[PDB]
Structures are given as structure tokens and as C-alpha cells.
Write a protein that binds this ligand. Sequence first.
Ligand SMILES: *[C@H](CC(=O)O)C[C@@H](O)/C=C/C(C)=C\[C@H](C)C/C(C)=C/C=C/[C@@H](O)[C@H]1C[C@@H](O)[C@H](C)[C@H](/C=C/C)O1
Ligand SMILES: Nc1nc2c(ncn2[C@@H]2O[C@H](COP(=O)(O)OP(=O)(O)NP(=O)(O)O)[C@@H](O)[C@H]2O)c(=O)[nH]1
Ligand SMILES: [Cl-]
Ligand SMILES: [Cl-]
Ligand SMILES: [Cl-]
Ligand SMILES: [Mg+2]
Lengths: 200, 131, 1017
Amino acid sequence: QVQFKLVLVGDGGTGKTTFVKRHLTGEFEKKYVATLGVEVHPLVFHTNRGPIKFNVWDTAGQEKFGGLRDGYYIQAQCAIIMFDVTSRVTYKNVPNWHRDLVRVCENIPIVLCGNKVDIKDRKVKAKSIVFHRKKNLQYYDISAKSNYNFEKPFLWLARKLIGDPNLEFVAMPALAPPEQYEHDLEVAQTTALPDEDDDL
Amino acid sequence: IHFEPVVKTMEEDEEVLYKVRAKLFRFDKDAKEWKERGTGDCKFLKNKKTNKVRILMRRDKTLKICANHIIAPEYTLKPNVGSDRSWVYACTADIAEGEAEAFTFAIRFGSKENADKFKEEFEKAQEINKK
Amino acid sequence: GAMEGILDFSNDLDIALLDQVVSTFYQGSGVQQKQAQEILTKFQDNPDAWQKADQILQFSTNPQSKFIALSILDKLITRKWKLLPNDHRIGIRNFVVGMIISMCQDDEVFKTQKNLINKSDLTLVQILKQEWPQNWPEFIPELIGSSSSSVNVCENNMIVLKLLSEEVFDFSAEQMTQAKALHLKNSMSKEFEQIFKLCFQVLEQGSSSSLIVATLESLLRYLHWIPYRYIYETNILELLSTKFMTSPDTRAITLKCLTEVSNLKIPQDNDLIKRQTVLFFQNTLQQIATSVMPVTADLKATYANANGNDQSFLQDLAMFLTTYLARNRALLESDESLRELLLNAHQYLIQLSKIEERELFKTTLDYWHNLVADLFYEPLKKHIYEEICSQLRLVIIENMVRPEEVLVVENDEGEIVREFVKESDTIQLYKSEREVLVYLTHLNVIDTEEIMISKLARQIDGSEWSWHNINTLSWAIGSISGTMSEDTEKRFVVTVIKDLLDLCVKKRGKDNKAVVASDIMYVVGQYPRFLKAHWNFLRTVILALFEFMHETHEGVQDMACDTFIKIVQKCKYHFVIQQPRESEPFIQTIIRDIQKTTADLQPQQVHTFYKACGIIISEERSVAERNRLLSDLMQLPNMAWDTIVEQSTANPTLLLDSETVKIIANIIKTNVAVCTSMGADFYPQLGHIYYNMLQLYRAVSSMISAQVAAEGLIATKTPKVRGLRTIKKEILKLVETYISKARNLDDVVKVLVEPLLNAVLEDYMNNVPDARDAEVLNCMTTVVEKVGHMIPQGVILILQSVFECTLDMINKDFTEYPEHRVEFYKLLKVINEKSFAAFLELPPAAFKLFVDAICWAFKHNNRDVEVNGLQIALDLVKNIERMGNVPFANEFHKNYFFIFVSETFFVLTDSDHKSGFSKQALLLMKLISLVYDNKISVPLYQEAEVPQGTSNQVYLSQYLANMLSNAFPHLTSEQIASFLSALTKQCKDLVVFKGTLRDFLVQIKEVGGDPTDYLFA
Ligand SMILES: *[C@H](CC(=O)O)C[C@@H](O)/C=C/C(C)=C\[C@H](C)C/C(C)=C/C=C/[C@@H](O)[C@H]1C[C@@H](O)[C@H](C)[C@H](/C=C/C)O1
Ligand SMILES: Nc1nc2c(ncn2[C@@H]2O[C@H](COP(=O)(O)OP(=O)(O)NP(=O)(O)O)[C@@H](O)[C@H]2O)c(=O)[nH]1
Ligand SMILES: [Cl-]
Ligand SMILES: [Cl-]
Ligand SMILES: [Cl-]
Ligand SMILES: [Mg+2]
């Protein structure tokens, strides 16, 4: 199996864990439960060059929960640095995360991501985001909530790591599927679905 | 004078009976809450060799399968208390993640019309699967 | 488990077990990896764990173990270093220095353990920050000497020096006190001459790529601060721009150095320094042309191939070329012999600008904007770049990103669909492209027209036809509106529209029609000047838009509505007057056919249409005529309204059914839409529905309550109750919308307000939390904002009804009821601003809750809440101060001064409220300045708690010293006393005051901070 270590860093509350969970299970987690040290999750994508597996090291952004800190970056093959476009302090700290990261990982592909662009009152203006240029980082506006550009960081990293600019995500093949409960369904019926005012 | 010139989704054997954009949820029993499983095109696929009709749903952009199961004759589309544009129903064998697993699904649509049209088709597919 | 053994410090450390745990974490998976991670974190966080570091370093066979060992020391060094006895400091220094030496001597390790050596070097740098130069004056000379004796060591010395420069000049601002930063910068400055001498020697000696690359990496850092003379008075520019450009290993880093050189502070009057600035550019451009690629090379293709490091190189080339030319291109503009170079540099940029890579394009586009803006004003310059600009016009036109207005897109099936969402991230790009293109058009309007008209010709005949090609072109044509003369525009727009109309006849099928429709709509909406001048054309466009309101293609339909309102916002005058040879103003014709015109639209599109009509109607300034048009416009909703206000007045239950509730909601939404555009002019329509509307608010409210009582809280999730709440929300929005724009405040107060308060307040107060609409709070904020000064008793009533019950909803945690939370503090803010008396009327108990509520806002991370919390606190203090020496102001300070001071300190120093720093500091400065200026008339202390006559100043300092002493027991009394002295003396200078706070925030993170740092100035 072709698998790569991806470390994910950024200030507390920027949306790192929520972004990964979205990719893992499809869900949107509304609550903020701070990561303690690191959470490691395998994440596979199917591509026209076969399956690529990212071993995602989702690290803690809060200083008091930082754990091993840069110790997590050892042997990382790629990275995502996350900030929150509604919080300027989180962009201010991007150079600090980048610094600690490239001191351990000297030559790896890194994507800078500005999360939470779904929120109306955006604070870190598009025009302001230039840190990536001199450091050769790919940049994307993303939202884990609306799924805006959510796949782009992994598509870019996979292109860089497999060394094929024409790599695309492709539809995984669909195996033919096979052929008390009443209590369980009634609780499901009577629990309201979230976000009933969304388009879908 | 001849000049020599320069030198699987697993759905090819299936008819698309119905397609609609949907958001799919699964019920976490432990925590009593619905969690999203995917947004994309929910398709009704009739196999040309068995005449069996399944739901196949794939997430936008990643194309990962979030639903894959036979539209069993026994299933029953039920309303959710919060919505006039969704159905909830229990599925005992979905293979999206891998191994056969039981879920309580909820599926929501752009409009009530789309929900109603879905149920009409769901029940049609059920009659096909009966034959 | 077996792995937990390392956590038992009562026994000797099993290094083998440590290595097992570490490799289980780094190389394992699942539960074993998760367990190991916690073990290691606990091990690392153990405050005696550092005593194991030497043991781990000596005896461990695992690089990651030694890495973690160094992290433990790092944490000790940066936080508790001065707590250690002096021999432990010497000891730790010695085995760090010894380990580095040792790992450099052994070639095998130096090659294969780069992570560990770099980590060891950073750790050394941490020791330097504490110890150097004061207790280590010979570090640099001994570093320099040691370099000569070994190529591995010399190379690693460069890494250490790079890191030191970084820590001292690039990352010190947040991490050190002002005084310590100055000390270390001065210390590096004084010994730099020798550092450079070694650096230059190594670069000149030119042996070993990896040593050279490391040396250049250190240079990149030095260039952030070193004096220009080190760059301009040595041979170093020649070496960078020739020698080091030729080898690919050193090319990356040299280009980045040369980019930094292009930013050095440099005299503007020295002819020779200018020649040197010209020569290094000339050299660099020559090496690129001969060793890398010629100016004709297809950089788009190269970048897309992504071989080796080509993308990063092209990125760095763009950065170098744009940085240098932005600063220096004037140096090349007047000398005939420098012209080829100027233009070659720009031709490389033209080629770079063709690369398909959004972020790179933005970097280049930033440069073009800088160029063309300069060519727009600077005399005699534009001719120089005429050929460059002509190529730029083509690049920009061919790469126009979709404007926000264009609502159709292509899907994966090759079908033109309505978009799923807004392309939020290409909005800024479009603006930037437009700006440059507008400039280029002004620079040569003939060239631009010719390029566009002929490109358009090649769409018609089919030679270059495609969706991509007609879109980018059409977007570009729309984007240059305003650049041409009215007469040229006339002919231009005519030609373009003729061609696009021809294109519509030719290309059939729903996909082609959607594409061409979208493009014509974008163009016509972009040229209102033309529309104003050509009524028959305008009319025909509007009728054509109305036809699209019946299209089954939903994207086209929605754009028709947006284009309609976009046109109307600019051309409304021509709809309101009777045009020559027309029997009536076109607004009359629109209103009449409104049922037919809007019959296939979704409701929100119907509301937009109505909103547009409101814009037109407000052009009529004769009040009689305006009100008649308003009445005519609202005929359908008023008739639907009238029949419901009878039916539901007969059967209060008939609101049970979805269909009626939807109808009602859409009626009020239509009113909101029209009120939004008509503002103050909407009043008579508000008057037609107002009392029945407020009665409806009451009826719907009863239904919501009835349902919650009968079904439970879950009822609020149901479509039925959500539909009823939508009605209440829209009613509140309409009243908010009107009052916010109202010009007759007397009618608002005498007619609108008393019935509004009656209808909404008690209903909010007496519903359960889950049934309360945060929109009530929002409506009330606008009421207080606009007429609060006129309704003092009404403000009191608002507070009584919402204050305590909302506070109790939001004061259990930071997350529940987010909208109420936000609207609540907005309402308190405006009440504190406009009707402060309302707070004076609160009983002491409720006033205490108010203070509690403000401080609670301080502690939010949510910026909406946090910021208002700080503002309220500041406004409150100002309100009290304004009262002067009266008993309420006196009791206020006695009761709450120190609560505000301590609460403000808490959020300043807890490290979880960093976004609020500026306003926190301002608040603290105000509070301290109150005492420093004797603006508090009574003693702040209890009688006999301190000697009688003791000034408040003396007591404040005593209170604060005690507070900090207990809150931060690791600080010395001298640190606290010095901090307070500075802070209190600096309470008239926000900039200096903030500096002193920031210095404090650095010192609380470590032990043994120097108290003299607070004398920095
Ligand atoms: C498809 C057309 C088809 O052939 O089916 C596109 C059509 O559905 C959309 C048309 C739109 C959105 C706007 C048009 C520009 C409206 C029209 C047709 C205006 C026509 C105006 C003519 O009077 C026009 C013809 C030209 O000679 C120029 C533009 C003159 C203008 C003189 C000032 O008048
Ligand atoms: N509106 C919006 N909220 C988001 C988005 N992504 C995450 N959030 C929210 O932000 C909060 C924090 O998310 P989380 O993933 O825990 O952030 P984190 O960077 O992992 N925090 P830590 O570094 O402490 O582990 C959650 O309430 C989550 O729902 C987004 O795209 N939009
Ligand atoms: Cl290591
Ligand atoms: Cl006008
Ligand atoms: Cl002391
Ligand atoms: Mg997290």
C-alpha cells in the first residue's frame, strides 16, 4: 500500500479535526472538543493511479494541549497548515506553525488553508493572504461546513506525492450489495434532522 | 504506402431508473443524533442480469460511496418530525464502508416535491425487486 | 500495561522500554499507538523528566527518543532555566555542545541523522538566548575557529547561525521582552563583521554544495537586517548573480537571497550603488537565459509538467522579477543600452503570467497592476511597454474568471447548470483582473477594441467558438465599462450586441442558449450608460429579461431577476418618467403585468422583482403619485392579505394548514423586499397592514405556545411551528427595516412603538427559552438606536422584559443560544450608549447582573460577543465618569472598580483571549488613568483596611501587587513592583502601555525575568 504521513497544524479552533472528520465519515461536527496531543486517522482516496492512503496526524492547536508538539512532525511527508478567515490572530500565527514545521520537515509539500469562508463576516481578507508565496505553499479558501474546496488540499498533495499533475479522484467501484428495531426507528423519527434551513 | 500511426465503476451493467440530489444521514444511537454521511446524486440502479434495483449514492467531488444497498421490499419510508422533505428508514445491509452493516438512514432533498417523487420511485423499485 | 513503566520515576529509566514505546508511537497504529502517545506525553510533561535527558542521549539507539529528550530540555530551557542551580546549567550546556560536536565528527551520523542534529542546534540556540553573550562571550569566535577544522562542523555552524538570526530578528517580537530583544540584536550586530567574514570566505572558497547551500541559507536570514554595505561593498553580489545561479543546487536559495537584496535599505542618490543594482539583475537574467531557459520558453507547459523543482523555481522567479522591477525598473528605463534587459525581464513575466496556477497568477497580476497604474500617470513611460502591454491585454482577456453575476456553470456531464454555491474565492481575482484591464484599456483603447472585436468575430464564424472562449471574452467586454468614450462605446456595444444576438440564433440547444443568454445579460447589465441613452433598447432588454422569467432553465431565470434589479439600480429614472412616444411610464406597464411576469418565479425571485419596482417608485418625489404607485405595486399582496385577515379573524385555527402560513410569510416577505428599497417612503404601506400585522403576531404566538404545550419542545422543530416562527421573524424584520430608515421619528414613537412593545415584549418574556426569537432583540436594538432618546420609559420596559431572562439563557456556557448571545450584547451596547438612564433605574441586584453580564462577555472567544463586551465596559466607565462626584458614581467605584480591573487582567493574561488584547489594554489604561488622575472622589478601600488619608494610587498599587503575587507566584516581588511602576506611569500612552503589558505576558511564561526590562524606552 502506498501511504503518506500528513501532519495537520494550526491554531486551536481553526477547524482541523472537523475538516478531517468530514473527510473520514462525511459528518459535520458542530461542537469544539479540543484535540489532546494528536489524533491519527487513516484516510484513503481512489485515484486514476490507484489508491493513495494518507495517515493523518491531526495535532492540537491549543498550547495547553500541545503534547509532543514538533515531535509529531518527525518523518511527515506532507502537511496542511490551517487558519480561520474569521480570526486574524490565526493567520498571524501561520508563520509560527510554518517555522516549527519546516525546521523538522525541510522539503515537503504543504498546503495553507483558510477555513470558515462560509461565515458572512470574514476578517482575513483575500488580498491579505500572501504568506504562502515566498514559502512555496499551495493556498485554498475552504469550508468544512459548506464543503467549499474541501477536496483540493488532498488532490494537490496527492499530485505532488505521486508526481503526476494529471492525477484525478475517480469513482470507487460499487460491489453488488446483499439481500428491537421498532424502538430504534421511533427514536430516529422523533429526533429532528439538523440544519433544516440548508438547501440540502 | 502505409504510414504507421503514433502508438471500472462496477455500474456498466445497470440501468439508471431515477436520480436526485440528496443529503444522507445516519442515526448514531449512542449519542441520540443524526450525523451526515454524504451529499450528492442518489441513484436507483437496476441490474440488467438480475433485475434487482439498488440505491447507490456517491459524495460530490470525492465520489466516495455513502450508500449501497438493495431497495428491500420490506423497508418503509417514514417521516422525520423536523422535516417535510425527508424520509427515514431502517437498512440492514449497506456496504458503503465495507462489511455488511445495519443503519437507520435519513435522506433529505431540495424540496417536498423531490421527497414525494423519491418515495413514489422507492415504492416502484420495491415492486420490481419483488418479481 | 508494560509500556507504562517509563512513568515510574522511583525506578531507573529503562531506555530499551522507552525506545519500544517511542517506535510503537511513530511506527505502530491503532490502540497501541494511541496508548504510547499518552504515555510519552505524560513522560515528557513530568517536571523531572529532563534529568533523564543525558541518560537518553547517551544510551538510546532511537533518534526519535533523543529528539523527544531534546524537546524536554527545550521546555526546561525556555521556561525554568534560571530556576536551575548554576552547575546544572553548565552541565546541560556541555552535553548539548558535546553531542553536536560528536554527531558532526562521525560522518555516518551527520549524513543520516539530520533531524536530530537540527533539533540539537535549535536546543543550543535556546541556551544562547538565555546565556549569550553575557555568560558566554566567546561563543562566536570559538564557533568561527571550529569551522576551519572540519567541513561537517562548518556546515552545521551555518545552521546554528541561521537559527540564531531567526530567533533574534524574525521571531523575537512575540517571544521576548523589548529589552531582551534589543540586547540580543545588538549582540549579534556587534559580532557580525566576523560572522560575515567567515560567510564570505566559505562562499568564495566554493567547496561542497551542501556547505555552500547552508551558507546561503544563513545569508538569506542575515539579509533581513544587516547593513547594506555588507552587500554592496564586497564582491558578494557578483557571486550570487553569476556563480551561484549556474549550479541548480544553489540556484533556489540564491534567487531568494537576490529577492531579499532587492529590498535592502539603499541610498537613492549614489550613482555607483545604482550601477551595482543594475548589474546583479543583468547577471541574473543572463544566467537564466543561458543556463535555465530562453525568454521564448513555454513556461505554462513547463510548470504543468511539474518536473523536479520547476514549479517552485518559476514561483521564485516570479517573486524575484516582480520584487526587483517594482522597486528598480526606473533604473532601466532611460539608458538605451538597458532597454533589452528591461523588456526581457518583462517578457519572462508575460510568460510566467500564462501559467495555469491561481495563486501564481495573483502574484504576477499584483505586479501588472503596479506597472499599469504607474504608466497611467508617469509621463513618457507607457510607450516603452507598448508591446508588453499588448501581450498583457491578451493574457488577461483570455483568463478572465467568472464574475459573481454569472450564475451558470458547466458540470461534469457537459451540461450548463445553475451553480450550487457562490464561487466565494474568485471574487477578489475578478476585481484585480478588471482593475488591470481597465488600466490597459485606457493605455490603448484602440488596441483593446480591435483585440475584442476580432476575437468576437472568430466566435461567430466558429473558428475559435467555445463556451470558455465566449465567456472569458464576454466577461472581459463587460469588465471594461467606463473606459471608452460614449460615442466609441455606442459603436462598440452595438457591434458586440449584434454579434452576440447573431450567436444566439446560431447556437441552439438548452446548453448553448444558457451560455449565450448569461453572457448577453452580463454585458447589458455592465453598460447602463448606453441603456440610459437608448430607451427602445432598454425596453427591449427588459422585456427580453421578462421572457427569461418564464424559462425552465432555472439558472437563466435567476440571472434574469438579478440583471433586472442591477439595471434598475442604475436606470430607474427612465422607468419612472413617460418616455417620448410612450403612452405611460414603464413602471405603470410593469406593475400591471406583474402577475403574468412573475408567475413562474420562485417566491424569493418574486420578492426581488418587487424590490426592484420599489427602487423605481422612490424616484417619484411627488408624494401623491409615489403613494399611488406604492399602492398599485402592493395590490396582489394587500388583496391576499385582506382576505386572510378576515378568514383567520373568523377561524383562529385556519393557520393550522401549511398553505396559509406559507402565503402569509410570502406576503410579509414581499413587504420587507419593498420596504428595503423604499425605506422612509414605505410608511403608508406599513400603515395599511400594521395593526392587523401586530394582531397576527399575537395570534401566531398563541399557536406556537399551544403547540409546544401539546407536543413538547420538539414542536419547535416541526415544519408547522417553524412556519409560524418564520411569520413572527419576518414581521420583526419588516418593522426593523422600516424604523432603521425612517425619517419621521415622531410617527415611529407616537404610532409604531407602543403597539410594537405591547405585541412583542411580554410574549418574549413569557415563552420558554427554546421558543424565544432572537430577532426580537435585534428589532429592539434598532428601536433603541433610532428613537431610544425619545422613549426612556420604553427602554426601561425593553430591559425588564428581556434582560434577566436572556442572561439566564446564555450564562451557563459559551455555546447555547448563539444568536441570542450575540443580539443580547448588541442591545445592551446601544442602551448603554443611547439611554444610560435605563441602567440607573435598575435595582442594585439587577445592576450587579449587568456588571456580571459585561465581564461574562469578556470571557467569550466569539468575537461578536467579546468585542461588544469590552466596548460596553469602556462606555459604562465613561458614563459613570460623566456623572461626576455623585453617590451613584461613588458607589459604582466602591462596588465594581476592582472587579473590572481584575477581570480585565484575567483575560489579558490567560492566553485564551488574544484577539481582544488591544481593547483589553485600552480598558485597563482607562481604569488606571481614572485613579492616576484622581477622578475617583472617594477612597477605594474599606475604612481602617489601610491608614486614613492613604491615596487611591497607593492603594491601587498595593491591591495589584497582591493580586499578581497570588495569581503569578513564580514572579519575584521586584518583577511585580517594576511592572506596576512602568504600567502606571505609562497610562497616558497606549502604545508604550501595550508594550509593557506585552513584556509582562512574556515574563509570566518563564522564571527569573529581569525586572529592569520594564524600564525599556
Ligand atoms: C437569444 C436571441 C435569439 O436569437 O433567440 C438571446 C436573447 O434571448 C436575449 C436577449 C437579451 C437578454 C437582450 C437583448 C439585447 C434584447 C434585444 C433583442 C434587443 C434588441 C435591440 C435592437 O433594437 C437592437 C439591434 C441592434 O441593431 C442594436 C443593438 C440596436 C441598438 C441601437 C441603439 O438595436
Ligand atoms: N462555520 C464553520 N465552523 C467550523 C468550520 N470548521 C470547523 N468549524 C467549527 O469550529 C469549531 C472548532 O473545530 P475543531 O475541528 O475542533 O478545530 P481544531 O483546529 O481541531 N481545534 P484544536 O487545535 O484545539 O484540536 C467547531 O465548533 C466546528 O464546528 C467551518 O468550515 N465553518
Ligand atoms: Cl529523529
Ligand atoms: Cl437613472
Ligand atoms: Cl525580589
Ligand atoms: Mg482539533
